[PDB]
Amino acid sequence: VQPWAWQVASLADRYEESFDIGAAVEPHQLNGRQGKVLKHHYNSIVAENAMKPISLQPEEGVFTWDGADAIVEFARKNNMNLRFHTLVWHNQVPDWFFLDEEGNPMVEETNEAKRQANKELLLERLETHIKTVVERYKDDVTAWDVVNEVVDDGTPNERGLRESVWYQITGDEYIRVAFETARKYAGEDAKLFINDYNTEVTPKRDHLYNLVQDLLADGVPIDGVGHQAHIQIDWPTIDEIRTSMEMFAGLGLDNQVTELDVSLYGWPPRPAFPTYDAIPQERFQAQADRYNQLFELYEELDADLSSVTFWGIADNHTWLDDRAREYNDGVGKDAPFVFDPNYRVKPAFWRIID
Ligand SMILES: [Mg+2]
Ligand code: NA
């Protein structure tokens, strides 16, 4: 039996010269054992869901701030930094954004002048969303995910831009406007990130690189790249991770690791173990070596890396379980963190605290 999380050395303290140590949270976890782990180990949080666009403006002019406020309030009381996730995304985003003034989907419109008008309306709505959220949280947020996942996994067009509805209506202008608007309202000191997953692998990595270089050339205000780091034990390689961060640092950008989790499985996640208890120790050891190498690399890059956030606290709550089930007939358990479902440490903890 391993010790409780609150009887071991603080992760935040261990890395205080290098980077913040963060966790994604839900409002209901901000007390009890999760609250205790959070206060002991972390100096940054992010909302797993409560600050996504649908979570804040489910219908036009109707803003739902409670869950988000609870998280901001907890960060404040416990002296934690706060990443904002996220101003722009193609999921968890309200349908009303993308209807013309006659209530029809803007994508269906074929008249060129009406399409132009729909583009302008959508960008107007985006600016209003951003302006309202920023005015409310600018004094609490220390990093903004201004856009999330705007780069494709394939090459449907030459720039590798995800062809979501945002793209279909505005091309790349939604991305421009999101940064310009965020900078305008949050001030020159705000830290503005473009966030994505598989930032370590090609061609995606290159599309993202080109996008940011293009945008920086046009004077669009991007301060850094958020590497979600939804990774596995052997993939991507340590070198792939390094190369990516070094590339973005070469453009004068900061890096943050934003949603770190180290799956026990590959992709797709199968065969998955059906319960936590069924998971054999070898998996936790292999994960511990992986974590050791990750955080040695992070430390090596700490001049160009300001924050590392895990996409959760302890192994009792992780979006990876949803994915494990989805590919194992509704049954499966992943275990991505350095803390177990009971908030006792796992082998990976010892290997990143030394
Ligand atoms: Mg170590
Ligand atoms: Na740093």
Q: What is the DSSP string of 99-132?
A: B-TTSSBGGG---HHHHHHHHHHHHHHHHHHHHH
Q: CA of 233: how far to CAs of 3, 274, 294, in Å?
A: 24, 19, 10
Residue 143: left (phi > 0), alpha (psi -120 to 50), or beta? Answer: beta
Q: Which of 128, 133, 103 is nearest to 118 (CA)?
A: 103
One-letter identity of residue 147: V
Let me know how many helices (H) and strands (E) the chain has, helices first: 12, 9
Q: Whole-angstrom Cα distance, residue 279 to residue 272?
A: 9
**Protein residues with C-beta less than 5 angstroms from the ion ligand 1:** 292, 351, 354
User: How many angstroms does the Cα of residue 303 sit away from the middle of ligand 2?
Assistant: 5
User: How many angstroms does the Cα of residue 80 sit away from the middle of ligand 1?
Assistant: 24
Q: Which residues are CB-neighbours of 202 under 8 A, at least 6 positions away?
A: none
Hey, which bits of 157-268 come out as E strands? 192-196, 224-227, 230-231, 254-262
Q: Which of 137, 136, 141, 109 is nearest to 122 (CA)?
A: 109
Q: CA of 268: how far to CAs of 157, 263, 271, in Å?
A: 26, 11, 9
Q: Whole-angstrom Cα distance, residue 35 to residue 42?
A: 10
User: How many angstroms does the Cα of residue 139 sit away from the middle of ligand 2?
Assistant: 22
Give the active site residues: 259
Contact 194, 225 (CB under 8 A): yes
Judge whether 18 is annotated as a binding position: yes
Q: CA of 218: how far to CAs of 206, 212, 221, 225, 281, in Å?
A: 18, 10, 9, 17, 51
- CATH code of residue 245: 3.20.20.80
Q: Whole-angstrom Cα distance, residue 193 to residue 265?
A: 29
One-letter identity of residue 22: G
Q: How far is CA 253 from the centre of its chain?
A: 17
Three-state SS for 57?
coil
Q: Taking every pair of C-alpha atoms in the chain, what is the biggest distance, in angstroms?
A: 68
Q: CA of 7: how far to CAs of 36, 47, 314, 354, in Å?
A: 11, 26, 15, 15
Say how many C-beta atoms besides its own lie within 10 A of residue 75's C-beta: 25
Q: Whole-angstrom Cα distance, residue 225 to residue 254?
A: 6
Judge whether 56 is annotated as a binding position: no
User: How many angstroms does the Cα of residue 18 sit away from the middle of ligand 2?
Assistant: 4
Residue 265: left (phi > 0), alpha (psi -120 to 50), or beta? Answer: beta
User: Which residues constitute the domain of residue 292?
Assistant: 1-354
Q: Whole-angstrom Cα distance, residue 321 to residue 326?
A: 8
Q: How do beta strands 230-231 and 20-25 pair?
A: unpaired
Q: Whole-angstrom Cα distance, residue 209 to residue 134?
A: 26
User: How many angstroms does the Cα of residue 290 sit away from the middle of ligand 2?
Assistant: 21
Q: Whole-angstrom Cα distance, residue 223 to residue 9?
A: 32
Instruction: For 167-202, give the DSSP string.
Output: HHHHTTHHHHHHHHHHHHHH-TT--EEEEES-TTST
Q: Which of 259, 280, 257 is nearest to 333 (CA)?
A: 280
Contact 353, 9 (CB under 8 A): yes
Q: Which two tokens stand for residue 195?
A: 């966030």
Judge whether 292 is annotated as a binding position: yes
Hey, which bits of the chain come out as E strands? 20-25, 44-47, 81-85, 143-148, 192-196, 224-227, 230-231, 254-262, 305-310
Q: Whole-angstrom Cα distance, residue 204 to residue 210?
A: 10
Q: Whole-angstrom Cα distance, residue 118 to residue 60?
A: 16
Q: Which two tokens stand for residue 178?
A: 């999101």
Q: Whole-angstrom Cα distance, residue 270 to residue 323?
A: 10
Q: Which of 210, 195, 99, 82 is nearest to 158 (CA)?
A: 210
Q: At what angle do helices 204-217 and 238-250 cross, to 10 degrees?
A: 10
Residue in the structure block whose two tokens are 């205000």: 221
Three-state SS for 262?
strand
In units of Å, what resolution does this entry have? 2.2
Judge whether 305 is annotated as a binding position: yes
- Whether the CA torsion 93, 268, 291, 34 is positive or negative: it is positive
Q: Which residues are CB-neighbours of 265 under 8 A, at least 6 positions away?
A: 232, 272, 324, 334
Q: Which residues are CB-neighbours of 239 under 8 A, at least 6 positions away?
A: none
Contact 176, 220 (CB under 8 A): yes
**304 alpha carbon, closest ligand:** 2
Q: Whole-angstrom Cα distance, residue 239 to residue 214?
A: 25
Q: Which two tokens stand for residue 286?
A: 């292999």
Contact 151, 204 (CB under 8 A): yes
**354 alpha carbon, closest ligand:** 1
Q: Whole-angstrom Cα distance, residue 179 to residue 197?
A: 19
Q: Which of 47, 53, 6 is nearest to 23 (CA)?
A: 47
**18 alpha carbon, closest ligand:** 2
Q: Which of 234, 256, 351 is nearest to 301 (CA)?
A: 256
Q: Which residues are CB-neighbours of 159 under 8 A, at least 6 positions away?
A: 172, 207, 210, 211, 214
Q: Which two tokens stand for residue 191?
A: 């830290």
Residue in the structure block whose two tokens are 């890096």: 255
Q: Which of 236, 237, 254, 232 is nearest to 245 (CA)?
A: 254
Contact 145, 86 (CB under 8 A): yes
User: How many angstroms does the Cα of residue 307 sit away from the middle of ligand 2?
Assistant: 7
The number of distinct structural domains making up the chain is: 1
One-letter identity of residue 282: E
User: How many angstroms does the Cα of residue 34 sit away from the middle of ligand 1?
Assistant: 24
Q: At what angle do helices 173-186 and 112-137 cross, to 10 degrees?
A: 30
- 81 burial (CB, 10 Å; 0-12 / 13-18 / 19+) is buried
Q: Which of 193, 88, 206 is nearest to 155 (CA)?
A: 206
Say how many C-beta atoms besides its own lie within 10 A of residue 234's C-beta: 10
